[PDB]
């Protein structure tokens, strides 16, 4: 579709999509000899993303930054496998995201979920320890001076997860929004909410993101780049779709429907029977509905 760029390769003068559009890694060209990556993908894509990267970057020591929106397994799975191959990279993540990588139990969930995505054929590259990643914690509101033409602000955007941040390039009216708006369903053309931590924070984050200067490019954690009206109206539409889901929940609960019943229905109606993102399955759908039920 015209308003959505969802193919691997070049997306803008400074911007490329690496790997699988469902779990993409974005490549920013910061200068003649300087690059950044945005989003951290899934572990099993290490060699695919590496192969794509080397088509654009002849010298991987020129990759200087890796920006991470949140701790979910599908947004940091590549780090232990590709960081050893990027000797100059600095991983930029929020305080709470960095904390997840020094938690034994959290690292265990991330690795189990990523291992489930391995094909029987493949073996992962040699990994460095999660607590040995070259990370620099970034704070809410901090300006990331990545290069002479790349200045991105860190914006706290909790609610999808308790650590989630977004990255705003105001020069380009470009927002890397992770999962904070949900999952864009390219079938129906609408956002599907992904409220896995706190509904009030998720909605509050979307209110603040609507107050940004009008977006030209909106780049979520899954599905590629959105432009035109999809970017300009994205945060508002995601807010609307979350309220719409709340109302549907309260409607059907008050007709005696159990959450498991509605979890099944919604999972079906959104296409769950590799269409939905890996993080939106019956169990996590059930978790989101639980969260919305409690906060309403
Ligand atoms: Fe997520
Ligand atoms: Fe995700």
From TrEMBL:
InterPro entries: Metallo-B-lactamas, NDM-1-like, RibonucZ/Hydroxyglut_hydro. GO terms for molecular function: metal ion binding. Residues 22-222 form the Metallo-beta-lactamase domain. This is Quinolone signal response protein. The gene is pqsE. SUPFAM superfamilies: Metallo-hydrolase/oxidoreductase (SSF56281). Keywords: Metal-binding. Fe(3+) 2 binds at residues 74-75, 179, 222, 279. Pfam families: Lactamase_B. Fe(3+) 1 binds at residues 70, 72, 160, 179, 279.
């Amino acid at each position: 579709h015209m308003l959505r760029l969802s193919a691997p390769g070049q997306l803008d003068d400074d911007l490329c999509l690496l790997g699988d559009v469902q779990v993409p890694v974005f490549l920013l060209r910061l200068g003649e000899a300087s690059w950044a990556l945005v989003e951290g993908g899934i572990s099993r894509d290490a060699e695919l993303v590496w192969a794509d990267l080397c088509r654009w970057v002849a010298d991987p020591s020129q990759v200087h930054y890796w920006l991470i929106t949140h701790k979910h397994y599908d947004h940091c799975g590549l780090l232990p496998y590709l960081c050893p191959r990027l000797p100059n990279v600095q991983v930029l993540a929020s305080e709470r995201t960095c904390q997840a990588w020094k938690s034994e139990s959290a690292v265990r969930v991330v690795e189990r979920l990523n291992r489930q995505l391995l094909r029987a054929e493949q073996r992962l590259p040699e990994a460095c320890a999660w607590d040995a990643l070259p990370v620099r914690a970034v704070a809410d509101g901090e300006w990331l001076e990545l290069g002479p033409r790349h200045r991105l602000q860190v914006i706290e955007a909790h609610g999808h997860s308790d650590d989630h941040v977004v990255f705003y390039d105001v020069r380009r009216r470009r927002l890397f929004c992770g999962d904070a708006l949900g999952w864009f369903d390219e079938a129906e053309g609408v956002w599907r909410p992904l409220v896995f931590d706190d509904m009030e924070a998720y909605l509050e984050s979307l209110e603040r993101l609507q107050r940004l200067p009008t977006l030209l490019q909106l780049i979520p954690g899954h599905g590629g780049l959105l432009r035109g009206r999809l970017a300009a109206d994205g945060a508002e539409s995601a807010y609307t779709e979350c309220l719409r889901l709340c109302r549907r929940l309260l409607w059907r609960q008050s007709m005696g429907e159990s959450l498991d019943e509605l979890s099944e229905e919604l999972h079906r109606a959104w296409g769950g029977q590799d269409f939905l993102p890996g993080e939106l399955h019956l169990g996590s759908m059930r978790r989101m509905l639980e969260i919305l039920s409690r906060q309403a």
